[PDB]
Structure 1
Amino acid sequence: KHSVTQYLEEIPQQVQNRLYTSPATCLAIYRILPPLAKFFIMAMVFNENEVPLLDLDKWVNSNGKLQFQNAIKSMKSLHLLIPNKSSGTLMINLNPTFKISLRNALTGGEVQNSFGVVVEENVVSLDLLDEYSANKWETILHFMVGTPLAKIPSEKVLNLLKHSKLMEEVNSTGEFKITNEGFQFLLQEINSQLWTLLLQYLKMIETSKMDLVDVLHFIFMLGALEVGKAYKIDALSETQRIMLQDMRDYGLVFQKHSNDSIFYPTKLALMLTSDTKTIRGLKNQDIPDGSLIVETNFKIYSYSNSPLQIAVLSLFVHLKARFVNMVLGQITRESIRRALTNGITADQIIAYLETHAHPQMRRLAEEKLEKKLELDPNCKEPLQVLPPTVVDQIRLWQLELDRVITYEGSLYSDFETSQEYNLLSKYAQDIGVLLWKDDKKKKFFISKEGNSQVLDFAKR
C-alpha cells in the first residue's frame, strides 16, 4: 500500500490548510488517523487553549506508548498541529483551520461544500445502476488484467494505467499484463485497488488545471455520503465538474444519464473509505459469490465461481477445463511457481486467501478459527487457524525460488558501552523489534522504535 496518508502528509503545510478549509475533508481525514491521535484530537478540539505535552504523555499508560509515538509522529508529519516551544515547553494545538472546520462540522457549521448534497426524489434503485457500476468496475478490472475480449474504452483510464505503469503489460503493443504493479492490482482487493487507481489518477492528473484543493474536496464529497440532488448540477467546480465526469467514467461515480443532473452517488465512493462489505443483465445472486477452495491437501475446491475472480485464482494455478461449479485447477509448488515467474511475492496471497475466496471457505476458516484465542492460553495448541502447514509450504516454495535473504532498517552504531546495548536489546526483545544484534560489533539493521523510545526516555 502506498498509504495515501503518506501522500497526504507529502503535500506542504499551506496547501494542507487549503484542504482543511473544507470541513467535510477534515472529517474524512479524521476518519483515517490512528485511534490514539483520534482521541487526542477530539480532546483538543474544544478547550480553546493550547495544552502542554506532559499531560498528553501522562494520559497514556505504559505498554502502548509506542502508539503515543505513532500518533504524534503522524500528526506532526502531516502538521495538523503546531508544536510550540513557547517557554521551552511544548504548547500543542492543531492547525486552527482544522479546529474551526471540524468544530463547525460537529455542530452545524458553514461548510456549504460538505453540504453540497441535494435531497430530492432519489429514484436511483439499489440494484438500479448499482449493477451498472459493478459491471463497469468489472470491465475495467478485466481489461487491465486482460480478458479474452477487453471492452475497456477508458482512453483516459488506459492512459493512466500505461503512463502510471499500472500493470507490467506492453501498452505499446496494447498489453495489459501483471507486473509488480499488476501483481499489486491482483492483490489489493477493493480498497487497495480503488486506492491505487485514485493515486494513479492523481499522479497523471496533476499537471495543469488541477486545483488540488477542489480535487480532494470533490473526492471526499464523493466519499462522504450520498450528495444526490444538484451534485453534478451545482455542487462542483468547473475543473471539479470535469474531474467528476472523469471519475464517473472511471466507475467511482454513478452519475445517471442525460449528462446533466445531480450527483449519482455510486456505492464505490463509499467503498473508498468504508473498509466494510464488498458486494456490489439483471441477475445477481445474493450470497458470497466468491468461489474457490484451499485446504491442507493443496487443491482447489470451487463450487461457487466468478469469471474474473476465478481468472485471478488461475493467475497462480493451472487451468484445464472450466466446469459448471468447478474449474480444473490444483494448487501446487509449480502453480505458485507460475506467479514466481512474474516474481510475485507469496505475501499478498496469504492474507488474500485469509480474506478472499472465504465466500467459499466460510466454514473452513471458522473450523480453523474455532475461537482458539481465548482458548489459546488454556489449550496451548492452536487448531490450524490461518493454516500454517500451507503457509510453510508456500514459504518453502518462495525460498526455493528465492535463494536470497534481505532485511529492512538501517545500520546502527555509537553503542559506546555494552550496558546500553544489552538494555536496548532486552527492550527490543520485549517489543520484538530486533532482527539481530551483537555487542561485539555494536551494530544492527532493524526498525527505529527502540532508538526512538530510548531517545525519548533520555530527553524527556
Structure 2
Amino acid sequence: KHSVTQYLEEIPQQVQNRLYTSPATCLAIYRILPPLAKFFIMAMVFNENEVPLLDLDKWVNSNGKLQFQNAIKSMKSLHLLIPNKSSGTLMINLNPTFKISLRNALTGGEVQNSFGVVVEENVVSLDLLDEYSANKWETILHFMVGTPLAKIPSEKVLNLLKHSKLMEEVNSTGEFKITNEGFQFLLQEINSQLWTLLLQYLKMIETSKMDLVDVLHFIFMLGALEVGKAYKIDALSETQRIMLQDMRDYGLVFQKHSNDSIFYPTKLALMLTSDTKTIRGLKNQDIPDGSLIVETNFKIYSYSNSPLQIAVLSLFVHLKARFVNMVLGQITRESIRRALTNGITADQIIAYLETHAHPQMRRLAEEKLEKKLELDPNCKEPLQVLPPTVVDQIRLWQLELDRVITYEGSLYSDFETSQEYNLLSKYAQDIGVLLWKDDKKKKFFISKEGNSQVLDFAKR
C-alpha cells in the first residue's frame, strides 16, 4: 500500500502550512490520525503551553508507548508539531497554523471550505447519480482492466493511467489490461482504486496549472460532504471547479445535468473518505447478482454471474461457457498461473477469494470461518480457515515461478553487552519484532522498533 497518508505527510511544511490554512482541510486530516495522535493533539489545541516530551513520555503506561514513538515519527513527517531542542529535552508544541486553523472550526469556525457548499435541496436520488456514478465506475472498471464493454470515456484518466502505466495494457496496441498495478488495482476494493486514482489524479494533474491547495479545498469540498445547492456555482475555484468538473466528469461527483448546477452529492466521493459500506438500466439485483465458486473443493460453480463481476474471476481460471447462472470453469493450480502468466501472484486473491464471489460463498466461507476464534484456545483444530489446503494448493502452484528471497530493515552493529542482548532477547520475544537475528553476530536487518522501547522504559 502506497499509503496516501505517507504522501500526505510527504509534502513539505510550507505547503502543509498552505494546507494548514483551511480549517476544513485541518478537519479532514484529523480522521487520518491514530487515536494517540487524535486525542493527544486535541489537548494542545486548547492549553496554550508547549509541553516537553518528558510529561508525554510519562503519560503512557505500559505497552502502547511504541505508538507514541510511532506518533512522534509520524507527526514529524507531516510537521504538524514543532519540536524544540531547547533544554536537552524535547519541548513539543503544535503547529497552530493547522492547530489554530482547526481550532476556529472547533467552535463554529469561519472555514470557508466547510461553508463553501450551500446546504440546499439535495435532489440527488439513490439510483440517480449513483447508478450512473457506480455505472461510470463499473463502466470504466470494465474498460480499464478490459471488460466485455469498454464504455469508460476517461481518456485523460486513460492517458494518465496509460502514462502512469498503472493499467498494464499495451497503449500502442490500445490494450487496457491489469498489470502489476492494474492487477494490484483489483486488490484495492473501493478506496484503494480511488486512492491510486486520487494519486493518479494528483500525479497526473499535479504539475501544469496545479493550484493544488485551492484544488485541495475543492478536493476536501468534495471530500467533506455532498455540496447540495450552489456547490459548483459558488464553492469552486478555477482548479477546484475544474477539478470538481474533472471529479464530476469521472462520476465521482454526481453533478446535476447540463454540468451547471449545485453540487450533486453522489456517494462515490464520500465512500473513499468513508472506508465503510461500499454499496453503490432498470433492474439490479445485489449483492448476490454476481457470484462464483471457490471452496475447499477447489472448483468454480456459479449460480449468479455478472459479466463485469465475473470478468475479474476468469483471468486466473479457464472459462467454458457463461451460463445464465454459471461461469463454467474449474480452478487449477495451473489456472491460477494464468494470473501468474501476467505475473499476477494469487496473493491478493487470498483475501480477494475470501472477499469476492462470497455472495455465492456466504454459506461456504461461514462454514470455513465457523467463528473459530473464541474456541481457538480451547479447540486446536481449525476448519480450513483460511483454507490451508488451498494455500498448499496455491503455494506449490507458484513452484513454476521460483527463486526470490529478500528482506527489509537496517544494519545494526556496535553491540557489546550481552545482558541487555539477553534482556532484549526475551524483550524482543516479548515485543515480537524478530524477523531473524543471531548472537554469533549480534546483527540483524529489521526496523528501528527495538531501540525506542529500550529508550523510554526508565530513562528520564
Q: Distance in 1 between matches of 2:165 and 2:459?
A: 46
Contact 1:290 1:356 (8 Å CA) reproduced: no
**Equivalent position SS for 2:319:** coil
Q: String of CA shifts for 1:283-321, please: whole Å, max 9, x gaps.
A: 222434441222111112322332222111111111111
Give the C-alpha shift of residue 440 in structure 1: 1.4
Contact 2:222 2:269 (8 Å CA) reproduced: yes
Q: Distance in 1 between matches of 2:281 and 2:155?
A: 25
Q: String of CA shifts for 1:13-67, please: whole Å, max 9, x gaps.
A: 0110111111111121111112221121222222222222223233322222222
Q: Distance in 2 between matches of 1:27 and 1:290?
A: 38
Worse overlay, 432-441 or 317-326: 432-441
Give the C-alpha shift of residue 79 in structure 1: 0.8
Q: Distance in 1 between matches of 2:16 and 2:308?
A: 39
Contact 2:124 2:266 (8 Å CA) reproduced: no
Q: Distance in 1 between matches of 2:305 and 2:63?
A: 45
Contact 2:146 2:177 (8 Å CA) reproduced: yes
Give the C-alpha shift of residue 400 in structure 1: 4.6
Give the equivalent residue in structure 2 for 1:67. 67
**Equivalent position SS for 1:183:** helix
Worse overlay, 80-89 or 309-318: 80-89
Q: 1:355 to 1:57 in 2, by over 3 A?
A: farther
Q: 1:107 to 1:354 in 2, by over 3 A?
A: farther
Q: 1:454 to 1:188 in 2, by over 3 A?
A: same
Q: Distance in 2 between matches of 1:452 and 1:89?
A: 16
Q: 1:30 to 1:288 in 2, by over 3 A?
A: farther
**Moved beyond 6 Å, runs of 4+:** none
Q: 1:37 to 1:176 in 2, by over 3 A?
A: same
Q: String of CA shifts for 1:124-156, please: whole Å, max 9, x gaps.
A: 211112111011111111111112442322221
Worse overlay, 261-270 or 449-458: 449-458
In the superposition, the TM-score normalised over structure 2's length comes to 0.95
**Equivalent position SS for 1:157:** helix
Give the C-alpha shift of residue 455 in structure 1: 4.3
**Equivalent position SS for 2:222:** helix
Q: 1:403 to 1:297 in 2, by over 3 A?
A: farther
Gaps of 5+ in 1: none
Worse overlay, 437-446 or 287-296: 287-296
Q: Distance in 2 between matches of 1:398 and 1:27?
A: 46
Q: String of CA shifts for 1:129-186, please: whole Å, max 9, x gaps.
A: 2111011111111111112442322221111111111221111221112211111112
Q: String of CA shifts for 1:318-367, please: whole Å, max 9, x gaps.
A: 11111111111222211111111222233211122232222222233323
Give the C-alpha shift of residue 203 in structure 1: 0.9
Give the equivalent residue in structure 2 for 1:445. 445
In the superposition, the TM-score normalised over structure 1's length comes to 0.95
Give the C-alpha shift of residue 12 in structure 1: 0.5
Contact 2:23 2:105 (8 Å CA) reproduced: yes
Worse overlay, 42-51 or 73-82: 42-51
Worse overlay, 383-392 or 334-343: 383-392
Q: String of CA shifts for 1:397-440, please: whole Å, max 9, x gaps.
A: 23452232222223322223444443333322222221111111
Q: 1:141 to 1:395 in 2, by over 3 A?
A: same
Give the C-alpha shift of residue 227 in structure 1: 1.4
Contact 1:304 1:360 (8 Å CA) reproduced: yes
Give the C-alpha shift of residue 205 in structure 1: 0.7
Q: 1:34 to 1:357 in 2, by over 3 A?
A: farther
Contact 1:425 1:434 (8 Å CA) reproduced: no
Q: 1:76 to 1:459 in 2, by over 3 A?
A: farther
RMSD (Å) for aligned C-alpha atoms: 1.9
Contact 2:302 2:328 (8 Å CA) reproduced: no
Q: Distance in 2 between matches of 1:328 and 1:92?
A: 63
Q: 1:354 to 1:47 in 2, by over 3 A?
A: farther
**Equivalent position SS for 1:459:** coil
Q: How many residues align?
A: 460
Q: 1:388 to 1:39 in 2, by over 3 A?
A: farther
**Equivalent position SS for 1:127:** coil
